[PDB]
Structure 1
Amino acid sequence: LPEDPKWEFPRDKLTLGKPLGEGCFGQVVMAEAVGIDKDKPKEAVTVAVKMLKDDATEKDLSDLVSEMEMMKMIGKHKNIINLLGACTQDGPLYVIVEYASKGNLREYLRARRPPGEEQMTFKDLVSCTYQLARGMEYLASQKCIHRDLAARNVLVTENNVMKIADFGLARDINNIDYYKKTTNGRLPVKWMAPEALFDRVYTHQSDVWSFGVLMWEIFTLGGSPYPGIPVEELFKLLKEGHRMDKPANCTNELYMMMRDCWHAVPSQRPTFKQLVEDLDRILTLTTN
């Protein structure tokens, strides 16, 4: 890993603490980093550090590396988790990201369902969706395809800012081998644009498909997509026209928008730009 000047962070100035989570990918822990906020070199900030597990594979490592490289290339945006730095020298690779205090969106929404712990308002639901649309409109503008959009891969900060995260599978628009059999083999199927598999391509319109599943997750307050449908049956059902039902209490308009995101023809789905303008409208006209 060639030493990167801007980004390296002293390994003796970081103190690891409580675990946060532990997938097949690696593990993430809470940590104190003193001086990661240059210029406030006095002050020690809560951060999350993502690293490998004792049972890591060569592919685990190069994935963590990639996720780090991707984060460097996309700018600061309000609705994207920021990389704060990395320890890459003389010890385990540590990728230091900004800490969200309220966890992932799926657990956040589940925790504040109506009791039959701060219940979600309809405007709050539309607000998350809008925020995430602005995040993705930014990403798409940066030539980045995320490819792993899902409620579990969003973070919620202390002031309820929605932060797109988990760049483990994200790529530059130009860094996907169209048409090869193994391309897109590692995308979660229930969140995946059909053309990702049938055609072995991936574009911003593919991310729109995923965005649509994300919406559904949001309006079911963190439900599981296609319930009672196994992954091995799914695409046969999608080619036949099946699409998830309208969540309770989500509006006809919002449901038309989900459906639009699940159009079989990529170009017929909204753009992120269109989703932002539409959600901007629904949000404001709610408040009034």
Structure 2
Amino acid sequence: ELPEDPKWEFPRDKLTLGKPLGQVVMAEAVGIDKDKPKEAVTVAVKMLKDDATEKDLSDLVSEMEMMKMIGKHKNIINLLGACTQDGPLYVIVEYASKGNLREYLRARRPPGMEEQMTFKDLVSCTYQLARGMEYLASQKCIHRDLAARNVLVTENNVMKIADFGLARDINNIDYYKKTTNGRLPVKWMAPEALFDRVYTHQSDVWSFGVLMWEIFTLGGSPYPGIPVEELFKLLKEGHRMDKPANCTNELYMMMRDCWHAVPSQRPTFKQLVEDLDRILT
């Protein structure tokens, strides 16, 4: 069924599938690193469950193809290889030993809210992620699922944009389907995505604002106490989240600018990068 692409193809005899982290498992990939071709490199492998749908398979194939076209960056989980032939589809990606940003932040919370993090650590985290999105945007990629749970942290605390399952080319949003943007978590979605069936880089900027609010609240849930059923109405009425606890007015203004009603009046990722560098220096 799946064509050949031997630049990306990786032998199935050299992949030992370990414990779970579709389903993702810890694996050892012997010779996946070009410069050390005998050593067992720890990677992440995404595959189908036994109860998978036709959509699950085209989603996974779509995700793989997306990660080949976007290329290489410090602040995105990078495609390492793929087993496409002669058995189950395996999509092989970088292992990030400290897991998702949400649990990473919640675990480092000071006591009494129910290694700790500095203001600068939270600004640095946001800045890493803005650089990741500046690259993705420049590669014509819209992510469509920016959230803390879809950021992974490496052993060295590097922030990696993950879960390209919903990612598209900019020119591959269907204005002429009702179902377009139907599988995006609504609490992270720009209103134009919710309503008008569009999605631009400026839709991702809105999401990145929500990610910022998650970062500065140390892994808090957006619109606390507000059901997704009521959020649609509160947004068109112009509701916006209030400032996180130890967060400066400045970074709150940044979140608020990401949540402008008009997509083209929101800042670009390039502008967020410039501004976050000045605050981090």
Does structure 2 conserve the Cα–Cα contact (< 8 Å) formed by 1:179 and 1:199?
no
Q: Report Cα offsets for 1:199-220 as digits up to 9, x if no partner.
A: 1100000000000000000000
Does structure 2 conserve the Cα–Cα contact (< 8 Å) formed by 1:144 and 1:173?
yes
Cα distance between partner residues in 1 of 2:71 and 2:32:
18
Cα distance between partner residues in 2 of 1:115 and 1:243:
27
Q: Report Cα offsets for 1:63-99 as digits up to 9, x if no partner.
A: 0111000000011111011000001111110000010
Cα offset, 1:179, TM superposition:
4.1
**Bigger CA drift: 35-44 or 160-169?**
35-44
- Structure 1: runs of 5 or more not aligned: 21-25, 283-287
**Bigger CA drift: 172-181 or 69-78?**
172-181
Does structure 1 conserve the Cα–Cα contact (< 8 Å) formed by 2:186 and 2:194?
no
| 1:82 corresponds to | 78
Cα distance between partner residues in 1 of 2:34 and 2:12:
15
Q: Report Cα offsets for 1:90-117 as digits up to 9, x if no partner.
A: 1110000010000000000010001239
Distance 1:256 1:179, change over 3 A: farther
Does structure 1 conserve the Cα–Cα contact (< 8 Å) formed by 2:75 and 2:128?
yes
**Bigger CA drift: 116-125 or 235-244?**
116-125
Q: Report Cα offsets for 1:129-160 as digits up to 9, x if no partner.
A: 00000000000000000000000000000111
Cα offset, 1:197, TM superposition:
2.1
Q: Which runs of 4+ in 1 moved over 6 A?
A: none
Q: Does 1:193 align with 2:190?
A: yes
- Structure 2: runs of 5 or more not aligned: none
TM-score of the superposed pair, with normalisation by structure 2: 0.97
What SS is found at the alignment partner of 1:169?
Answer: coil
Cα offset, 1:177, TM superposition:
1.1
Report 1:1-288 matches (<5 A).
Answer: 1-20=2-21, 26-116=22-112, 118-282=115-279
Identical columns (%): 100
Cα distance between partner residues in 1 of 2:199 and 2:260:
15
Cα offset, 1:42, TM superposition:
1.0
Cα offset, 1:39, TM superposition:
3.4
Q: Report Cα offsets for 1:16-58 as digits up to 9, x if no partner.
A: 11111xxxxx100001010111232111100000011011000
Aligned residues: 278
Cα offset, 1:198, TM superposition:
1.6
Cα distance between partner residues in 1 of 2:227 and 2:164:
26
TM-score of the superposed pair, with normalisation by structure 1: 0.95
Cα distance between partner residues in 2 of 1:213 and 1:197:
15
Q: Report Cα offsets for 1:231-255 as digits up to 9, x if no partner.
A: 0110100010110010001000000
Q: Report Cα offsets for 1:159-211 as digits up to 9, x if no partner.
A: 11000010000000111112421111111100000000221100000000000
Cα distance between partner residues in 2 of 1:87 and 1:122:
42
- Superposition CA RMSD, Å: 1.2
Cα distance between partner residues in 2 of 1:141 and 1:103:
26
Cα distance between partner residues in 2 of 1:180 and 1:96:
32
